[PDB]
């Protein structure tokens, strides 16, 4: 049906618009401004690229600009995947992903079984990796791995302002493509 | 609320009032703080299809304000025009050229996808009473050329789309047709 909706959720200022621009254009968002309301960009995605079953899909990235009233629940309809974005320099943004994710999966809590049972693909992306001093890099990656595990989610950590963070063939780009393939599969080829 | 997705494009020149209109349609409140819309903005109009009947069904109607200009060759935004169930064509009543460009916007979509159309003129309040006659003649031609209902309004007046108003009846009928012709 070619239609795919992926929410991009996280606290204000964590880098959602910068990430989406990188995912959709392989270019850094040079002039980021405060996102008002819901911004949508489209990633033209080759499903199963390189295979005889290769098929192009338009993946909508819905960049919701709210904070954890309940009027943004209307944006959470018909969701096929969720990207949960946190700022690695800002532990509070990481904590709030427990609220961001529940806000969709229900429409200050953590229920491990709710995430064992959830079928909507989840991807946890930590931004501003470049700002993490290497002495503390190890500690933040351990914390972030446990975060991905709580959500039963793949994790990617990157610098949204570095085009090599998502350059073709890179480890990040492969994980991103795998996530988008899973979104498409669970909506259609299930 | 239905899980079916309903997509309405909101097209028109920059600055004609698209964000103010969308915000009024989706929130029944005036956009107090309008800024230059960067990229594609989406808001949701919650619409009760067949309200009052045993078949009443709620739809989330996506209003996609894609943006851009009809002077480009850019024009990579064609992927935003897929799976369209309706189009709102917005022009500024004080700006005749924005009305002429609606002919370009419509062709740009009908080359890059009968989709229901609604033609909305903004800034009615800026129309001097002397020029009201000329502006009604012009907008009737848009309605006829696009085979569309037409609404002219002031997006900065909250009552311009209030429930029970003639404008709200036309809007509701348009959204019914969007649903009836798709989803
Ligand atoms: N160094 C570095 N800066 C980043 C990174 N990601 C985002 N930024 C910067 O952080 C600021 C916020 O980025 P932005 O993309 O606007 O966040 P946002 O989540 O969209 O913010 P908002 O719209 O809810 S206000 C910008 O100045 C941007 O350049 C990153 O990975 N590394
Ligand atoms: N008097 C009056 N002013 C209006 C009306 N509609 C919009 N405006 C004003 O016109 C200006 C532009 O409105 P806006 O809603 O931002 O247009 P836009 O098409 O979204 O502009 P852009 O995002 O492409 S830059 C705003 O100052 C707004 O308050 C109207 O019906 N009457
Ligand atoms: Mg933003
Ligand atoms: Mg605007």
DSSP per residue, A70-109:
TTGGGGGTT--EEEEEEETT-HHHHHTHHHHHHHHHT---
Resolution of the structure in the document, Å: 2.0
Among A50, A27, A14, smallest CA distance to A174 is for A50
Specify whether the CB–CB gap between B119 and B148 falls below 8 A: yes
With a CB cutoff of 8 Å and minimum separation 6, the contacts of B141 are none
Mutate to test the pocket of ligand 2, among B16, B20, B120 (most ligand atoms within 8 A of CB): B20
Interatomic CA distance for residues A11 and B122, integer angstroms: 35
The values of phi and psi at residue B9, to 5°, are: -75, 145
Interatomic CA distance for residues B83 and B85, integer angstroms: 7
Interatomic CA distance for residues A17 and A33, integer angstroms: 9
Cα A57 to Cα A25, A101, A180, B85, distances in angstroms: 15, 25, 10, 19
Nearest chain A Cα to B66, which residue? A40
Q: Show the tokens assigned to B101.
A: 């460009």
| C-alpha gyration radius of chain B | 16
With a CB cutoff of 8 Å and minimum separation 6, the contacts of B23 are B29, B30, B31, B43
Partners of A167 in beta bridges: none
- Residue with the smallest CA separation from ligand 1 atom 6 is A15
Test the A interface: residue of B3, B38, B64, B66 with most A CBs within 10 Å = B38
Q: Does A69 touch chain B (CB under 8 A)?
A: no
The values of phi and psi at residue A46, to 5°, are: -85, 105
Half-sphere exposure of A24 (CA within 13 A, CB side): 26
Interatomic CA distance for residues B17 and B12, integer angstroms: 9
Interval between CA B35 and ligand 4 midpoint (Å):
7
Interatomic CA distance for residues A29 and A87, integer angstroms: 16
Question: Is residue A68 marked as binding?
Answer: no
Q: How far is B138 from chain A (nearest CA, A)?
A: 34
Place of tokens 């780009």: A173
Specify whether the CB–CB gap between A165 and A159 falls below 8 A: yes
Cα B48 to Cα B56, B58, B71, B155, distances in angstroms: 7, 5, 38, 22
Q: Does A78 touch chain B (CB under 8 A)?
A: yes
What technique determined this structure? X-ray
Cα A27 to Cα A3, A11, A63, A135, B71, distances in angstroms: 24, 22, 17, 29, 24
With a CB cutoff of 8 Å and minimum separation 6, the contacts of B129 are none
CA B115 vs. chain centroid, Å, equals: 13
Interval between CA B109 and ligand 4 midpoint (Å):
19
Question: Is residue A18 marked as binding?
Answer: yes
Inter-axis angle of helices B132-145 and B96-110, nearest 10: 10
First to last CA, chain B: 12
Interatomic CA distance for residues B82 and B64, integer angstroms: 11
First to last CA, chain A: 14
Which residues surround ligand 1 with Cβ inside 6 Å?
A 12-18, 29, 32, 34-35, 65, 127-128, 130-131, 159-161
With a CB cutoff of 8 Å and minimum separation 6, the contacts of A131 are A88, A89
CB-based contacts of B49-52 (< 8 A; 24+ apart in sequence): B49/B175, B49/B176, B49/B179, B50/B176
Q: Show the tokens assigned to A146.
A: 């446990």
């Amino acid at each position: 049906l070619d239609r795919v909706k992926v929410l991009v959720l996280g606290d204000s200022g964590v880098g959602k618009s910068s990430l989406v621009h990188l995912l959709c254009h392989n270019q850094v968002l040079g002039n980021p401004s405060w996102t008002v309301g819901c911004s949508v960009d489209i990633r033209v995605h080759d499903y199963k690229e390189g295979t005889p079953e290769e098929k192009t899909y338009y993946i909508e990235l819905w960049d919701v600009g709210g904070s954890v009233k309940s009027t943004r629940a209307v944006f959470y309809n018909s969701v096929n995947g969720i990207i949960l974005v946190h700022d690695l320099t800002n532990k509070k943004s990481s904590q709030n992903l427990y609220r961001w994710s529940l806000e969709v999966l229900n429409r200050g809590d953590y229920d491990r079984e709710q995430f064992a049972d959830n079928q909507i693909p989840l991807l946890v992306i930590g931004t501003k990796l470049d700002q993490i001093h290497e002495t503390k890099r190890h500690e933040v990656l351990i914390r972030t791995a446990f975060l991905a595990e709580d959500f039963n989610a793949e994790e990617i950590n990157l610098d949204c302002t570095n085009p090599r963070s998502s350059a073709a063939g890179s480890s990040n780009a492969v994980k991103l493509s795998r996530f988008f393939d899973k979104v498409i599969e669970k909506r259609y080829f299930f």
